[PDB]
Structure formats: C-alpha cells, structure tokens
Amino acid sequence: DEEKVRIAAKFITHAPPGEFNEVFNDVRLLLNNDNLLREGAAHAFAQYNMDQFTPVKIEGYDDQVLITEHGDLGNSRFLDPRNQISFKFDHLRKEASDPQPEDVDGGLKSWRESCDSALRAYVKDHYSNGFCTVYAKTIDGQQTIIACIESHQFQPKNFWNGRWRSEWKFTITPPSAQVVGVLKIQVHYYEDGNVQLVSHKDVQDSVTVSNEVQTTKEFIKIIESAENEYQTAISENYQTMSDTTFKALRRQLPVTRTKIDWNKILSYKIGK
Amino acid sequence: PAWXAXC
Amino acid sequence: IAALVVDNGSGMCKAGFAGDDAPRAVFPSIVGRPRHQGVMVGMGQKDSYVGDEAQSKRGILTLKYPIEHGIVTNWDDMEKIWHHTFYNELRVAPEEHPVLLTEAPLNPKANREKMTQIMFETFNTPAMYVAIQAVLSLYASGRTTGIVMDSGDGVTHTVPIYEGYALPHAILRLDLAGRDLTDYLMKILTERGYSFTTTAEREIVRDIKEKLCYVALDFEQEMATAASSSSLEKSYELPDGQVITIGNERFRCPEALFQPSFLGMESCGIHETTFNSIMKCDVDIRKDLYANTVLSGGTTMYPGIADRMQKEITALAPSTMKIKIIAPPERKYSVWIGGSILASLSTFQQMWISKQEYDESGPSIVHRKCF
Amino acid sequence: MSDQQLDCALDLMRRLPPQQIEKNLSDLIDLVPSLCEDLLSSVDQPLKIARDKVVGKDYLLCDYNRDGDSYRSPWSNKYDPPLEDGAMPSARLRKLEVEANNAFDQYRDLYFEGGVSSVYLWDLDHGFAGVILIKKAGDGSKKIKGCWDSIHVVEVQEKSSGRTAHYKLTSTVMLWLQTNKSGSGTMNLGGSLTRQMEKDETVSDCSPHIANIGRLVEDMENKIRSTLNEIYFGKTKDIVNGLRSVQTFADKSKQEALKNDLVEALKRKQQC
Ligand SMILES: Nc1ncnc2c1ncn2[C@@H]1O[C@H](COP(=O)(O)OP(=O)(O)O)[C@@H](O)[C@H]1O
Ligand SMILES: [Mg+2]
What is the DSSP string of A237-253? Predict the structure, then answer.
C-alpha cells in the first residue's frame, strides 16, 4: 500500500490549480479503492490550498478571505483579520462554515488593518478580479505585516488557464524597517498541443516609518512598482528577447537566410 | 549597354 | 464647413473632402531634389519637387520617400507633402476646414504628438482627429465585423475588427509590402538581363509591377506550363521604346507574398499572418471572422490573388468554417473611403479635437489615450 | 474499465509538466502494473543518447531502431548488445539510410550548430518508413538553460506506375526554456506540439527520395516553429496582460464606449 499513497501525493501536491480537482478525479479513477486516496489527499490539500493562497467565502461575511499558514490555527480552522472571526475550511468542497468569534488586544494588529483597507482598492485597480488578506503575527519577538494578493482565471471553452500568487512581509522597526516578498505566475494552454509559463520573483527592501497614511501609501507604491515592472518585463522583453534566445537554441531560417538545397547539401562538404 | 536594358 | 480627409499612406497620399466616394487628390508621396545643376536660370527651378511634378521630372531628380516601411523618416519632408496637399493638390487653406489624419496601429506614441503639433501649429486646422487606418477599411466595406488584410507600399496590417472595434492584442504588423515587393522584381528582371538602379529607375519598375505581374493559383503547375511554352510571355516598353520580354517572372514576383523565404524574411506570409491573427481572438468570434475576410490597399490588386488567398488560408483553418474573401474592385481606396464616411457622421462632428482644445491643452491631449 | 485507466493516465500525462515525464511515468507504472507496455508505447518522452564505441560517434535511441533487447547504431550498423538474428534493413535501404544521415547531419548543423541527431529507416512491403531525431541543450556557461527535441516519423507509399510516391509525415517537438535575466526574476516555459502533413510527389533523376522527405521536414519544422513562437507570445501576452492590467483597459473601455455610439450613428448615416 504505502508506495501508492506517496505516488498520489506527488501528483496532488504539484497539480496545476485550474486542473487539480480533475487530477484528483483522474487518480481516483485510476486506482480501484477510494479510501487510500481520500485519506492522503486531505493532508495534501491542507498544504496545497495554503500554497495556492486562494480564498473562500463565508456565508455571513459578504467578502473573500485568503487561506495560508499565517491564517492556520491548527485544529482545521483559519483566521480572518478584517472581520476578526475564525472559520472551518473544507479541503475537498467549495464552501466554508460554522464561524466562531476571535478576541485579542490588537494594538499591533490595528495599525495595518488601515493599510489593508487601503490595499484592497489598489487590488481592484491591479486585477479585473482579485482578493487579498493581511495577517498579524509575532515571529520570534519580531513585529510583522504579511500582505497577500491573488488571482485565478480559467475558461474550458478557451483551452487556457492563468494564475497569480503574491507574498509580502513588512517588519516593523523604528526608524528603519525591513521588507521581504515573492511574486509568482503560472499559465497553461492545451487547445491542440501544450504550452506552459512558470515564474517567480523574490524582492528584498528597506523602508522608514512615519505615519499610518504614509506607510499605507508607501507599501502600495512598492507593490504597484514591482508588479508593473514585473509584468512590463514579462510582456515587452519576452516578445523580443525570447525570440532571440529561442533562435539561439534553434533558428527559424538558417545562417544563410535561405531554405536549404538537397543537391548542394548532399554534394558540398563546405570548408571548415 | 551591356546590359540588355540599362548599361 | 466640410471636413478634409487625409490618408498618410506609405506610397501614395489619398486626400479630399468628406462625403465624397473618391479622393480629390491621389499622388506619390515623394520629395524629389535635384540630381544636377539648374543651368537655365530662366526656368524658375524649385529646391524640391513633389507628386506628379517629381514623377514628370523623374530623370533629373533624387526621389526620397519620407515614409519607409511605415514610419516617418524626416519630419520636414512629410511636412512638405502636407503643405503641397493643401495648397497645391486641393487648392485650400488648411486653417479653414476640419481635418482627419489616418495613422497605423502600434505606431509609437510620440508620432501622434508630432502629427498633431504639425497639423495645429504648422497648418492651423480648426479641428482634428487621428484614426486607425484598418477600421476605415471594413467600415467602407459596410460590414461591422471581420479581419482586414491591408497592404500598401510599406506595411501589411492584419486586424480583426469586432463589434466595430480593433482588437489590439491580435494586430500583426508585417514589414512586407509594395516597396519590398518592388525590390524583388528588380532581381528577377536582372536574371533575364534588364538592369535598374537609380531611384528614378525604381519608379519605372513600379510601373511594370502594376501591369504584367499576377498571382498563379498553384506555383509549380503554372511554372511548368511557362517552362514548356512561350504562350505565357508578354511585353512592356520603357520610356526609351525598347520592349522587355517577360514570362516566368510574372507569377514569380507576387509569389513572395505567400513565400517571405524568397526574400529571406523571417516573418510569415500574407495568408499566414491573417490566420495567425484570427487564432488570437475570443474563440466565439472565430466563425464570425472567417466569413468576413476583407482585403485592401494597393498591393491587393493582383489578378488571381483572391482565389489563391482562399485556397491558401483554407489549408490553415480547420475545414467547413466557411472562409470567404471580400475582394471586389475599388479596394484600391477603401481606407480613404472609410474616413470620408466617418467624417460625414454628425456624432463625429462633435467628437473632433477642436483647435481651441489643442490651444488650451497642447500635445498633452493624447496622454489620456496613449497610456 | 482498463481503457478508461489508460485514458485518464494519458490525460494525467497532458496535465503534468513535461519536464517531469520520466519521473511521473516511472511513478505511474509503479501505481499501475499491467498498463506498463501500453504506457511506454503511448506516452512520448525525451530521447536517450548512445555512444558507438567502434566508430567514436553519438546516436539517439527510439522504439523503431530498437529490436527487442538492443538498439542498432546508424554508424556501425551493429546492435548493442549484439543479436543472433536482428531485423536489419536491406543493403540498398541501408545505403539510403547513410545518405539520409549525412543530409540530416548538414541540416542539423545549419539549424542548431550543435547538439546531436539520428536517422533510421525500416523496410515495408509497399515502400519505406523513417525516423529523424534531434536533441540540443542550451549553453551551460550562461544563466539561461534549455533543451529542444525533434521527432519526425514518416511513411512512404511507392506507387505501381508513373513513378509517384505519397508521403505521410507525423511530427512532435518538445521544448523547455529556463530564463534568468534583466533583474525581473526567472521564467521557465514548457512546450509540446504534434502535427501531421501529407503530399504526393513524382520521383526525379536529379533529386532522390530523401530530398522529397527533406522538403517536407523543412516546411514542417518552419511551420511547427512559427506556430510555437506565436503560441508562446499569444498566451504569454494576452493572459499575463489580462491578469494584471486594469487602468489601460478602463481607458480603452472609454474609447469602446465612445466608438460604440459612433458605430450606432453609422447605422443611421450609412442609411442616409
Ligand atoms: N494594380 C496594381 N497592381 C500591382 N500593384 C499595385 C496596384 N495598385 C497599387 N499597387 C501597389 O500598392 C502600393 C501602395 O498601396 P496603397 O495602400 O495605395 O498605398 P499606401 O499604403 O502608401 O496608402 C504601391 O506600391 C503599388 O505598387
Ligand atoms: Mg494605405
């Protein structure tokens, strides 16, 4: 038995997020028994859904909250920093339910809930469709803001699927603060043959702390700048420079700029 | 003049 | 007051007042300077010549096109083309009538400023607008959706226009056009011993290209026929009275539009860039496009080109999509025709950038649009 | 049941990344024995390099050059390991095979200026069939990495009279590019396309059958490559721009709105 559940775990863990549910269906059709797959897939889906960072909607909140390690309470429940209410998330099904209220002193927390509320608007202005969450946690005595932004786009009729992930950590320190983050892009097309795009960028920065409005504006300016430069390179450079590097791996026309001629190619072992 | 229609 | 419609084509400038179904001025967009000294001072000879004056005076002038491939190369030369357009070709003061300029999609944003600044500040236009050429073409063809294959002297442009909009993501600018096609004729003529070098001589070749050349429906079958029998051979005599005898060359030149390989061009051929454009669309509109293939601009005139284009693009598309080629006569001028219709709309008569708007906002009027 | 196991196995091998094919295939035959032979035949996978020790030259391994326990080298004409029988070509087909290897060695040299290739032909009662193989790795001195693989499989029908042959070409191109420049992070792109093309041509006294084959291969590789580059730029532009653009799209929507009303007015003024 144990090999089968490790083979399934690799497929479930690495699956493309427009297609992961279908891959689970594929693996459950491939093997004869449900239980050995279902029980491993729950543990995989915990880890997996957190790294997708994807939201769920809770039926009384009227908003979308992202899911992550910084949100994970243990005991199968997740935080909502805006609404301040914990909830259980199902890892197979679409919905989440039975919420419970969460209380704290919230000093450090309150300072960025403002900044979060600001960020939401700039998300609306970055993505046609887009969702966010800003986590508040003490890490080994450090004071941190963890801000995250998300997009899923899919359509079966188009045979393309396209996805976005972002992580930003800002460490509160007077007068000078530190920043760390990662940005990722994944796209798949499969109409007749297949093509895939995979990417990351990692960012480190230093900042200074002044006022609630100014930090709100500044963090957003960095996110704005970084995402727009990252998109600008990934469109404008790749439409030209990738043609030249792909050409350097295989050419479109030869060094001659002519179609080759079989008579001369057979006969003429042209000089060294 | 060499050329058929030119030099 | 009536509007003036101007088509800033690479080869010929088509111009006239709105509502008219044919332009009032059509001339080669050439600034021609002296090749030699003007010894007979009594002539009143000119620092440069333009249009049909340069083409009459061909043998003594260095003919420069101000647009090459598709971009303006020297603004003052283009400015002379415009000055001549107003004062000489149309015999009007540009201060006195609204003006429409055609423009190509994906032309860099600074060009829009230069054109706008020249038209208000050199030519004092009382109102102005700048339009994507290809849109005007379909518009003129009546239809409210389709794919344009517009090719003049400089750029081949493919645009899928849907619900009356250009879809910018699908626009395939192709650097193969009439001028490039002219060059290749020079070479295949050279094979048979005819030579042409001077820029004057280039324009002679252009006259030949517009007459003897045609598109064969299938290349080696035609060529095998031509290699067998002199029946496919015709002639056309230069200004110096000598006939040129020509066969195999007639289909061979415009074959290049289907085979950019013949010229070493890395870009795909005319049917190809059309398909390659179609496929980029919102999938639901694919069949909306295939029934609505629209050809235009001077290079689209060759006999048999539509029938070939059909048999060609039929291979690329999945079958039974009903691909149809819209290629009647008058497609020499669809682009300018479209502007003439657009400039007849009362809503458009509200929509122009006014002289007063530019006189308050300067070139910054375009920065809201250009991103 | 078992036909659906093979179908969902192939769907899985469409959805999983092409970089991990051999890992994922070994895992998939470990999760399903019995299907191993079907899987190894149906699933396409990167080629394997071989060295002919008698000649001192490289070749590539495929299921057509293989005959049971061993593979025939295109240079020495022997199998490794050696065999008591072996399904050899005819002597004249072998001579043709040498001529093909030489022609396609030039072809590859001109298009790639590196990597390795192989050519093999198998005798048929109605003509000949053939495989052309190519492999090329990227520059290991650079940040940018990659590979390109060619598979062309061709079947030739030699007709009874009028010296025509009909050619049926199948082709697959496998790609991965890894890219690590301009300070905008890194991107990996995977690609796999498959095509078929058919033609009939008259045999000539000046150009042998290989020149025909070759004309199809060149026209096919041009078509495949052009298709590939445009598929990359198409999806990498439209989806990435669509995900993280908003303001340009709002201003273009203002142009759409104005232009709509102009088009509505065109209905009336075109009638007028
Ligand atoms: N009947 C014809 N036969 C061949 N070529 C033609 C014909 N009519 C026009 N052309 C070519 O079209 C080119 C210009 O096309 P056009 O679109 O009218 O100019 P522009 O693109 O500069 O506006 C010229 O170079 C000319 O050679
Ligand atoms: Mg034009």
Answer: ITTTHHHHHHHHHS-SS
- How many whole angstroms separate alpha carbon A119 and alpha carbon A217? 9
User: For this experimental structure, what is the resolution in angstroms?
Assistant: 3.8
Measure the CA–CA gap between C244 and A64, rounded to whole angstroms: 77
Q: Which of residues 124-143 of D touch A (CB under 8 A)?
A: 136, 138-139
Class level of CATH domain C176-267? alpha beta
Domain that holds residue A3: 1-104
CB contact under 8 A, C244 and B5: yes
- Residue pair D156/D209 in contact by the 8 Å Cβ criterion: yes
On the question of a common fold for C2-133+335-371 and C176-267, the answer reads no
**Ligand 1, atom 5: nearest CA belongs to which residue?**
C210
Looking at A83, A104, A125, the residue that finishes a domain is A104
Residues A5 and A118 both lie in one domain: no
**CA distances in angstroms from C251 to C215, C218, C226, C303, listed in the order given:** 5, 10, 10, 10
Q: Is A109 part of a structural domain of the chain?
A: yes
Taking a C-beta distance cutoff of 8 angstroms, is the pair C20, C6 a contact?
no
By the 8 A CB rule, do C242 and C121 touch?
A: no
What whole-number distance in Å separates Cα of residue D100 and Cα of residue D156? 14
Do C346 and D269 count as a contact with CB atoms less than 8 A apart? yes
Tell me which fold the domain C134-175+269-334 belongs to.
Answer: Nucleotidyltransferase; domain 5 (3.30.420)
Answer yes or no: do C193 and B3 touch at CB < 8 A.
yes
Domain ranges of chain C: 2-133+335-371, 134-175+269-334, 176-267
**If we measure between CA atoms, which residue out of C165, C160, C171, C152 comes closest to residue C107?**
C171
Q: Looking at CA atoms only, how far is residue D256 from chain A in angstroms?
A: 17
D228 CA to centre of ligand 2 in angstroms: 31
Residues A110 and A210 placed together within one structural domain of the fold: yes
Paired tokens of C5: 């419609």
Residues A238 and A115 in one domain: yes
- Pick from C268, C280, C345: which is nearest to D234 by CB? C280
Is CATH 3.30.420.40 the right assignment for the domain spanning C2-133+335-371?
yes
Q: Does B1 touch chain C (CB under 8 A)?
A: no
Taking CB atoms and an 8 Å limit, are C144 and D263 in contact across chains? Answer: yes
Q: Which method was it determined by?
A: cryo-EM
DSSP secondary structure, chain D, as one string: -HHHHHHHHHHHHHHS-GGGHHHHHHHHHHH-SSTHHHHHHHS----EEEEETTTTEEEEE-TTTEETTEEE-TTT--EES--SS--PPPHHHHHHHHHHHHHHHHHHHHHHSSSEEEEEEEEETTEEEEEEEEEEE--TTSS-EEEEEEEEEEEEEE-SSTTEEEEEEEEEEEEEEEE--TTS-EEEEEEEEEEEEEEEEE--SSS-HHHHHHHHHHHHHHHHHHHHHHHHHHHHHHHHHHHH--HHHHHHHHHHHHHHHHHHHHHHHHH-
Distance from the Cα of C53 to chain D's closest Cα (Å) equals 37
Q: Is residue A214 part of a domain?
A: yes
Q: Is residue A263 part of a domain?
A: no
Domain co-membership, A36 together with A110: no
Tokens of C363: 């070139």
**Alpha carbons D266 and A213: distance in angstroms, whole number:** 49
Number of alpha carbons in the 13 Å side-chain half-sphere of residue C110 = 3
Indicate if A37 and A137 belong to the same structural domain: no
> Looking at the structure, do residues A245 and A119 belong to the same domain, yes or no?
yes
* Domains in chain A, number: 2
Vertex A89, ends A86 and A90: CA angle to 5°? 160
Question: Cα C301 to chain center, whole Å?
Answer: 12
In a domain, A232, yes or no: yes
CB pairs under 8 A between B and C: 19
What are the residue ranges of helices labelled H in A79-161?
Answer: 107-124
- Examine the domain organization and report whether A110 and A160 are in the same domain: yes
